[PDB]
Amino acid sequence: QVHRFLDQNPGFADQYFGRKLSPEDVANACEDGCPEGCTSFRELCQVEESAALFELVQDMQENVNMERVVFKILRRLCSILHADRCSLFMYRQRNGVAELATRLFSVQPDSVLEDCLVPPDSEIVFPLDIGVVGHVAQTKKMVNVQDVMECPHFSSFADELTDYVTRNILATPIMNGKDVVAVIMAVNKLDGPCFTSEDEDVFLKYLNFGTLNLKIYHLSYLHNCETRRGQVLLWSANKVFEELTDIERQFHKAFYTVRAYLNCDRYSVGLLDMTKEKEFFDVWPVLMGEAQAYSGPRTPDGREILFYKVIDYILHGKEDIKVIPSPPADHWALASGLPTYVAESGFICNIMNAPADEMFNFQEGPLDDSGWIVKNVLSMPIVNKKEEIVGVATFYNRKDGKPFDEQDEVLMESLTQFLGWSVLNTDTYDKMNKLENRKDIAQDMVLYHVRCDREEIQLILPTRERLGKEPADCEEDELGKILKEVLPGPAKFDIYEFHFSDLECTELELVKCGIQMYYELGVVRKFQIPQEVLVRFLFSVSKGYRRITYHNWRHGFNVAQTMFTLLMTGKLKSYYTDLEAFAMVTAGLCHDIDHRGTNNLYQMKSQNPLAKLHGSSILERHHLEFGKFLLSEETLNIYQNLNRRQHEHVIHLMDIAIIATDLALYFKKRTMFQKIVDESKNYEDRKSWVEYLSLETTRKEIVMAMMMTACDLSAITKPWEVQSKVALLVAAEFWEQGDLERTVLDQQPIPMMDRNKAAELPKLQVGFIDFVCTFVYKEFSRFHEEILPMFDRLQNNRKEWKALADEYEAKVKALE
Amino acid sequence: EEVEKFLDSNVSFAKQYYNLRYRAKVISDLLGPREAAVDFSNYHALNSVEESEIIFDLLRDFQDNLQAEKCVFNVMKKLCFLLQADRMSLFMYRARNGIAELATRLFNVHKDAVLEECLVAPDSEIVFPLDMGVVGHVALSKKIVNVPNTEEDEHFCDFVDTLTEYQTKNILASPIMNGKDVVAIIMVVNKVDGPHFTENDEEILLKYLNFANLIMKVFHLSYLHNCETRRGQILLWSGSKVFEELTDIERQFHKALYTVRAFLNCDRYSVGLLDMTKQKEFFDVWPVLMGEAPPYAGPRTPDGREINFYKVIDYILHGKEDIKVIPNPPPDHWALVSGLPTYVAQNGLICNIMNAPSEDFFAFQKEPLDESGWMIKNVLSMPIVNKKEEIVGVATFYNRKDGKPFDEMDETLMESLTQFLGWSVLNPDTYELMNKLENRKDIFQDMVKYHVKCDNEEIQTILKTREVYGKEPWECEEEELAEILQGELPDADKYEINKFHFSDLPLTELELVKCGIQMYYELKVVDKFHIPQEALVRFMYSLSKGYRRITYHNWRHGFNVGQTMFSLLVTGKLKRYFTDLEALAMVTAAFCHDIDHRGTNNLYQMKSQNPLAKLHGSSILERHHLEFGKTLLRDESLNIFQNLNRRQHEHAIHMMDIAIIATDLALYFKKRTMFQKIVDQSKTYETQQEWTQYMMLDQTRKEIVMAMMMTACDLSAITKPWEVQSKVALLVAAEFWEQGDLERTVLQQNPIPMMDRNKADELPKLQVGFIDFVCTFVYKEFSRFHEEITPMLDGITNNRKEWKALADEYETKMKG
Amino acid sequence: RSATRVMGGPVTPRKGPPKFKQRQTRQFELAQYGI
Amino acid sequence: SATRVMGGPVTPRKGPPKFKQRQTRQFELAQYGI
Numbered sequence A: 001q002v003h004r005f006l007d008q009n010p011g012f013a014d015q016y017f018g019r020k021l022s023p024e025d026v027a028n029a030c031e032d033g034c035p036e037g038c039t040s041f042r043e044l045c046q047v048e049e050s051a052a053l054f055e056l057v058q059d060m061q062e063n064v065n066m067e068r069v070v071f072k073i074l075r076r077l078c079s080i081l082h083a084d085r086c087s088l089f090m091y092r093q094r095n096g097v098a099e100l101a102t103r104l105f106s107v108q109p110d111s112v113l114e115d116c117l118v119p120p121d122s123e124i125v126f127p128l129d130i131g132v133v134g135h136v137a138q139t140k141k142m143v144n145v146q147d148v149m150e151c152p153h154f155s156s157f158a159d160e161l162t163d164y165v166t167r168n169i170l171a172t173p174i175m176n177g178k179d180v181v182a183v184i185m186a187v188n189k190l191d192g193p194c195f196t197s198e199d200e201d202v203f204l205k206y207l208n209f210g211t212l213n214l215k216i217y218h219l220s221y222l223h224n225c226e227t228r229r230g231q232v233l234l235w236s237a238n239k240v241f242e243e244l245t246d247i248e249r250q251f252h253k254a255f256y257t258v259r260a261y262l263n264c265d266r267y268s269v270g271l272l273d274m275t276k277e278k279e280f281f282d283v284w285p286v287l288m289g290e291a292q293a294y295s296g297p298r299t300p301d302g303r304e305i306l307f308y309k310v311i312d313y314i315l316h317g318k319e320d321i322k323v324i325p326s327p328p329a330d331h332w333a334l335a336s337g338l339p340t341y342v343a344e345s346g347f348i349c350n351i352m353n354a355p356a357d358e359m360f361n362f363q364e365g366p367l368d369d370s371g372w373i374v375k376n377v378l379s380m381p382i383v384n385k386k387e388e389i390v391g392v393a394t395f396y397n398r399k400d401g402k403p404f405d406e407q408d409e410v411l412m413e414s415l416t417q418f419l420g421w422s423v424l425n426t427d428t429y430d431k432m433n434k435l436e437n438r439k440d441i442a443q444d445m446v447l448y449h450v451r452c453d454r455e456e457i458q459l460i461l462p463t464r465e466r467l468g469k470e471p472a473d474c475e476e477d478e479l480g481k482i483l484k485e486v487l488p489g490p491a492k493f494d495i496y497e498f499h500f501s502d503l504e505c506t507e508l509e510l511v512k513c514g515i516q517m518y519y520e521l522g523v524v525r526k527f528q529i530p531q532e533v534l535v536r537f538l539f540s541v542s543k544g545y546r547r548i549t550y551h552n553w554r555h556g557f558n559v560a561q562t563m564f565t566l567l568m569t570g571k572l573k574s575y576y577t578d579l580e581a582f583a584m585v586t587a588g589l590c591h592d593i594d595h596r597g598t599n600n601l602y603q604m605k606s607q608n609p610l611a612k613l614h615g616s617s618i619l620e621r622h623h624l625e626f627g628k629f630l631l632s633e634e635t636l637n638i639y640q641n642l643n644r645r646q647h648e649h650v651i652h653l654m655d656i657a658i659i660a661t662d663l664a665l666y667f668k669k670r671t672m673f674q675k676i677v678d679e680s681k682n683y684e685d686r687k688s689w690v691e692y693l694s695l696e697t698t699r700k701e702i703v704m705a706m707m708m709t710a711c712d713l714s715a716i717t718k719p720w721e722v723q724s725k726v727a728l729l730v731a732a733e734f735w736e737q738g739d740l741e742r743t744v745l746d747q748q749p750i751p752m753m754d755r756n757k758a759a760e761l762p763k764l765q766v767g768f769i770d771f772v773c774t775f776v777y778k779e780f781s782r783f784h785e786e787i788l789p790m791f792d793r794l795q796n797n798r799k800e801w802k803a804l805a806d807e808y809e810a811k812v813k814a815l816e
Numbered sequence B: 001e002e003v004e005k006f007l008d009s010n011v012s013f014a015k016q017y018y019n020l021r022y023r024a025k026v027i028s029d030l031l032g033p034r035e036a037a038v039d040f041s042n043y044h045a046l047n048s049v050e051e052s053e054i055i056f057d058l059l060r061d062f063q064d065n066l067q068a069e070k071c072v073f074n075v076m077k078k079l080c081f082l083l084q085a086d087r088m089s090l091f092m093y094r095a096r097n098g099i100a101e102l103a104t105r106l107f108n109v110h111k112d113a114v115l116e117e118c119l120v121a122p123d124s125e126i127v128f129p130l131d132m133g134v135v136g137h138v139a140l141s142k143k144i145v146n147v148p149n150t151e152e153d154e155h156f157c158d159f160v161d162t163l164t165e166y167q168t169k170n171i172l173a174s175p176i177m178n179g180k181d182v183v184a185i186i187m188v189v190n191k192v193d194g195p196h197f198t199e200n201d202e203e204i205l206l207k208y209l210n211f212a213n214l215i216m217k218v219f220h221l222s223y224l225h226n227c228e229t230r231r232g233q234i235l236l237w238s239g240s241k242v243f244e245e246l247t248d249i250e251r252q253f254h255k256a257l258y259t260v261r262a263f264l265n266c267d268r269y270s271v272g273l274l275d276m277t278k279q280k281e282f283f284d285v286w287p288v289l290m291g292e293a294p295p296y297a298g299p300r301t302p303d304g305r306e307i308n309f310y311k312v313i314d315y316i317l318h319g320k321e322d323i324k325v326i327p328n329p330p331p332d333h334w335a336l337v338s339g340l341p342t343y344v345a346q347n348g349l350i351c352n353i354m355n356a357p358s359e360d361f362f363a364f365q366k367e368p369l370d371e372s373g374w375m376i377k378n379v380l381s382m383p384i385v386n387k388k389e390e391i392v393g394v395a396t397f398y399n400r401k402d403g404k405p406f407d408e409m410d411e412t413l414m415e416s417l418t419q420f421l422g423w424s425v426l427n428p429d430t431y432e433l434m435n436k437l438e439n440r441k442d443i444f445q446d447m448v449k450y451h452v453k454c455d456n457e458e459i460q461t462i463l464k465t466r467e468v469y470g471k472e473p474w475e476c477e478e479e480e481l482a483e484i485l486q487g488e489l490p491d492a493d494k495y496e497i498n499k500f501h502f503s504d505l506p507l508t509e510l511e512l513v514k515c516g517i518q519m520y521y522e523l524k525v526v527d528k529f530h531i532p533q534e535a536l537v538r539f540m541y542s543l544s545k546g547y548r549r550i551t552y553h554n555w556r557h558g559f560n561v562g563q564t565m566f567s568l569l570v571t572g573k574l575k576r577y578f579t580d581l582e583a584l585a586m587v588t589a590a591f592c593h594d595i596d597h598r599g600t601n602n603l604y605q606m607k608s609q610n611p612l613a614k615l616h617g618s619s620i621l622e623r624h625h626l627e628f629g630k631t632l633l634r635d636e637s638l639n640i641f642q643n644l645n646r647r648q649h650e651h652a653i654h655m656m657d658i659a660i661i662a663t664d665l666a667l668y669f670k671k672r673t674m675f676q677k678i679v680d681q682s683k684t685y686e687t688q689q690e691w692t693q694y695m696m697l698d699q700t701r702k703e704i705v706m707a708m709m710m711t712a713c714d715l716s717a718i719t720k721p722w723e724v725q726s727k728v729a730l731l732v733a734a735e736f737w738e739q740g741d742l743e744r745t746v747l748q749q750n751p752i753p754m755m756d757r758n759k760a761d762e763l764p765k766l767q768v769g770f771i772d773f774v775c776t777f778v779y780k781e782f783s784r785f786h787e788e789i790t791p792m793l794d795g796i797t798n799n800r801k802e803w804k805a806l807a808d809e810y811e812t813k814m815k816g
Numbered sequence C: 001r002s003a004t005r006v007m008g009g010p011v012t013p014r015k016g017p018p019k020f021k022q023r024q025t026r027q028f029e030l031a032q033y034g035i
Numbered sequence D: 001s002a003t004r005v006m007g008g009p010v011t012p013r014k015g016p017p018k019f020k021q022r023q024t025r026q027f028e029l030a031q032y033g034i
């Protein structure tokens, strides 16, 4: 009524209101004596605002609800600023470009939450540069527009859509640590032509509480999103590192596991091919003209686009995950064409309001009987370390209903990025399978070229003539009758003597003599060894040995025969069971199996694959590995009619004996055998010593280890007419290695391995006798008095070699 | 002036006018910096005006730069004045190793205090367990606790009271709530005037706790969000460094921990790797059992192995980055001297240490370890778990950067990193496994190469250099080898080498080998490409040895196909379209097409799941023969292409690959209509010269023609005279019967009638069907292409007539 | 009904070819005898 | 200082140290051979 007079007289109004008003009030007003706080109404408005703000603070304290608290602030701010309405514009980031969408629109001092809350399907999303709301967010600074008609950045799209007119706009972003959360805006000043300076000063200061709510709401959203990202990376790593699997199994496990944190109604993963080039018989129809060249989409790597398998995850309603090999182009996931486009370009695609999209043919309506309509889509490529796309992951219909924002974009991108690097595990898995298959093929090729065939076994075991049947069909009694007639007797060749010579027998007779050795030990009967298998195994070992100068099949029977002689003629069997003797003689056969002709040192220097695989005792472990592999074959397994405990004991015994042949290992443990033989003199008689020694396991293993060494160097203990020739074979093999070292390794060989210093051989033999063979046979002769012929013969051979070295030394001095 | 009466008559209009034109101004003044206007020097009851001023003062502190410590301190002073108290304190809630703790942050807060006199440094905090104390009672109860008298309280303790020389009579506390998990506790120590704190004082506390909760909630959310972001970044970068490549555990753990050095936020940390040697070799354990050395007595892992930190990597971050790797660290090392990493390996428990020098269990250094005064205060040591629960390392994290002791958030952040590192041991485990597998494969490939290679003694059967010149083959000159070869090799005209009716029945395998070198000489590819004659002879003998001794697909079949190709290229004048190098590769391809044939077709390889089937997918044996042939040619001593150009070698290898892969029938059957068009083009062309010129350029036409030549040479047994075809068909039938028997024995599948041994009398009918099905099309079209191939067509027709007669005789016999 | 007077779609006042995010590539005496 | 503690954090009850347990609970042609 009289408002115009009061406006025309600001001084009178200030003076009148500054008067102290009576104790009487209007309505309640929480009058705890507050009529005169330097103004009649100042306390009344202070009390009302303090009470109103306190209620807002209580709302923030429990069950944080930004929409309601901001609504109350905006509703109160509408009366404060006299703006016809207020609004809230949330900030979102999609595809790397910022957008702003409405959450609370056209709030009035007499409005309610239901009439102001904007559902996600009714959002007016505003890019950063198509409105004043965009200009405020881009500048990160408040904007006060007195009249909007002349505003360069204004767009009438929103006010024409809602049938409204705007004249003055206030807006400021709600920053949170340099990041924009939202921008509250008030429009249409109802009282004045525009918004004054004091009106705007209130807008900044009164909005601190609204800033706090959005700061709390933003932090809670960020905290929850980062928590979910940490879980998916942790769960994916757990499933990826579970084992080595192909792409399909590894990707299926990871995506299925993290289905809880994704918050997507549906998502499908399509796997791309990796065939870089087609084979020739597929190129011929294209080049000749029988078929047309492929002209469809291609990867950035220049690869044909073909999803050979699409995995479908359905999380809305019922969980019925499907895997579709060779999916058709009519598949609901691939029909839209977005998974295709992502693979062509390698982009990250975020789609809001999918039915309104134009480039991608998204389905018009429901997909299945459940009436599920695709609304928001997010697709990214799965790229490995070599910058190649191996698949496309596409997520649909965020569970909350809001479009896929930046936080969801980085959550799924991290999952795909981690899984992309995990492709190296699949590539390693494929390579390992290829290596294993290639090794098995090579092993089979080894076995055939080494195993005795059907026609070769007839030389030792003729059954097609005596009986007319193949050996696999003859009974064991018949086979023994054939062998007993064919095999040489114990007296035909002196296999029982320390002076046995193998230079007057053919290789076939050596194999036969080997079979005779097993028969004399009695191991054929008690262990029920298949006689056909025994012959086949012995021939296979003979073929397994190479055709080199010294480390040939002949060395491997002489060591075996010497071990047989030691057990039976040296009477060292008293400490060993028949089974232990059975394994001990066999280790003599495989003592130098597949020896390449070069010592252990040459393997390391030449960097053979043997050196990398073993490291210590390179060749000795190689012989054990090859011998056990040869024994693992069914047709060559003499250790087949044995108990599991017995078979393991035989294998374990073979491991020590084979590796004990290494001279480096012998030199470090020969003192232990010196202690053991000294303990023999402590005892009274051999009977007591036999009883004590036959029970101790480590002591028996130590003696057997140097029993390998004694048999290994047994060639020296042979008579001089044999040692002289064998030493030449040993020297020739070492010269062959010496020539090899000079050729490829380009290293000067030692005088022992040098062909030029061949005249020094007698001196080297004497030094080697006085270094290694002296200890082994001296202690064994002291240990067992039956080994004395091995020691006397060595001394005679040392005397013969000493004379030759002296004669060579005299010739050199005479020449000098 | 009369309007003043109007305003007084209706004060509601005056209030509305003020709410219109002065409320914004008043709120702006209140929300300005300003200060509290309440007299804090008395204890009068708080008026609603004073209540509003206090509330506005608290809301003033609500800014973007929300310093939690300062803002809580102010409301603590306001609570002091409101509650009439003497002092209050605030304790943060920290979670050590499972057991929660309460540590002070704001202490001794009175109405006339400042932040500097109340803020508590991390080294001045008073940690409190949950069990003891009124504060511990508050946190456990999760509700407000009022203590009218400390003497009667059952949880009151005098530890701080003695420590601070203060006496507490009345304790009033309340835990700050952020959801359910407690964040801080604010408590009061005394009442200035009054027996205790009344219910009105309690109501004030919960009323004013809203601001404290809001300030504390923001701080807690920010800390949690930052910790989750750090965890996510740690996991992502660690995954990137793990999946960079496949390496050992030392290099892998180095990369991941060095990369996350910024996110870790630790001044120092060191990781010690445990040795994985579970079991020691026999020679290493002999002295222990023999008494030479005493057994191990030191710390032992839960798995039973000795604790041996063989390699420790330490990271120094407080000053200059000094990352160091210490192989075989001594116990004097700063990380292991305390014994905490040793203890963790013993047990396997996550350990958080606060004030390590004050600890007595471990001998932590109590002196500055660095020249700058760096001193160990907080330590966190955790295991690396591993998939098999076998601890592979111990990660120890030293002093935190901010100075606060390690809490549950840092425990979880490092726990995720250690769990991920323990999961990422499959890669180092696979790295060693793949290396060992590759070495074993190389060893066995060397074995097969030696077993198939012709040795130096066998080559003298052809290249008799020793009996002619006395030198080794590798020493003789090129001319000398030719003269020996010229005398030794057979004559092409005498043996009918370039004929279509060549029979290998009256020739030995060595003679067939000698024939092939003669074919190579006749093709004039030896002088043109300067092929080493010694390698050429050795290559053919190695092929002969590599060919298996199985019934049909033996070396004789390999030579006959090559003989057929040579006879084609020479007699049928099919070399006009092919270069000399192409002729050289084609004959070699024909010779090597069936190298190392197991004797079973492709179907048996798939059905039996042979390692060839797993490796090769489409053409099992044909790819294997190509692979083995290329491996044979790769050998230096067997390479006949060593003198070819890089382009020339690649062209020959590609052409050989085409031929050998096309040798199969499945590819031939599909790509045979193309051959029908090729001969049709020849007939369309007028004279042979233009057509020959066209073929001399076009490559896809030549390659298809070559495949037809291969599939015609492979089936060339059918076109040989009846005396030869009668025997070869029996060999083919015998091989198929062997494969059928193998199928029936191994796979329990009924063999097909072609492969059935029982249906041996149906062989003529099957041969007639095979002739009408496969060979007829090839030999009819080849005869049309070249008139010189007519004798081939005559041969197949006669053989088909004989087989038809035999089939008719068998049918007549079965008719009855 | 909604106060924004739009149903069934987050209507965008921008009409143009959509832009899609690029992938992040920010590295995110014994020796005498050969023994 | 306010808490009268200069050296380091102090605990009222001092016994043998306690350590957390490791987290493990969460994780015609066919006739012829072809």
Ligand SMILES: Nc1nc2c(ncn2[C@@H]2O[C@@H]3COP(=O)(O)O[C@H]3[C@H]2O)c(=O)[nH]1
Pocket: A085, A086, A087, A105, A106, A107, A126, A130, A131, A132, A133, A134, A153, A154, A155, A158, A159, A162, A163, A164, A165, A166, A169, A185, A187
């Ligand atoms: N009807 C109505 N329109 C608004 C409201 N708030 C903002 N707008 C309008 O939405 C528009 C978005 O872009 P502008 O900021 O340039 O200008 C704005 C205003 O014209 C509101 O509360 N009600």
Ligand SMILES: Nc1nc2c(ncn2[C@@H]2O[C@@H]3COP(=O)(O)O[C@H]3[C@H]2O)c(=O)[nH]1
Pocket: A551, A592, A599, A661, A663, A712, A713, A715, A716, A727, A730, A764, A765, A768, C033
């Ligand atoms: N100098 C010399 N060394 C030998 C002799 N006999 C064996 N060796 C060496 O001793 C080693 C042990 O047995 P090996 O056959 O494995 O290889 C042998 C050779 O290296 C020999 O008579 N003279």
Ligand SMILES: Nc1nc2c(ncn2[C@@H]2O[C@@H]3COP(=O)(O)O[C@H]3[C@H]2O)c(=O)[nH]1
Pocket: B087, B088, B089, B107, B108, B109, B133, B134, B135, B136, B155, B156, B157, B160, B161, B164, B165, B166, B168, B171, B187, B189
């Ligand atoms: N001197 C002093 N002592 C306090 C303060 N706050 C808490 N305390 C004391 O620290 C103690 C912790 O255990 P109690 O809760 O049983 O009792 C408490 C009080 O006695 C403070 O601000 N100043």
Ligand SMILES: Nc1nc2c(ncn2[C@@H]2O[C@@H]3COP(=O)(O)O[C@H]3[C@H]2O)c(=O)[nH]1
Pocket: B594, B601, B663, B664, B665, B714, B715, B717, B718, B729, B732, B754, B766, B767, B770, D032, D033
């Ligand atoms: N039924 C039948 N098949 C043959 C005959 N000759 C060759 N084949 C088949 O044709 C194939 C040609 O390639 P292969 O030599 O590897 O194996 C051969 C055999 O499988 C034959 O005389 N009769």
Ligand SMILES: [Mg+2]
Pocket: A591, A592, A619, A620, A661, A662
């Ligand atoms: Mg050896």
Ligand SMILES: [Mg+2]
Pocket: B593, B594, B621, B622, B663, B664
């Ligand atoms: Mg073949």
Ligand SMILES: [Zn+2]
Pocket: B557, B561, B593, B594, B714
């Ligand atoms: Zn063939």
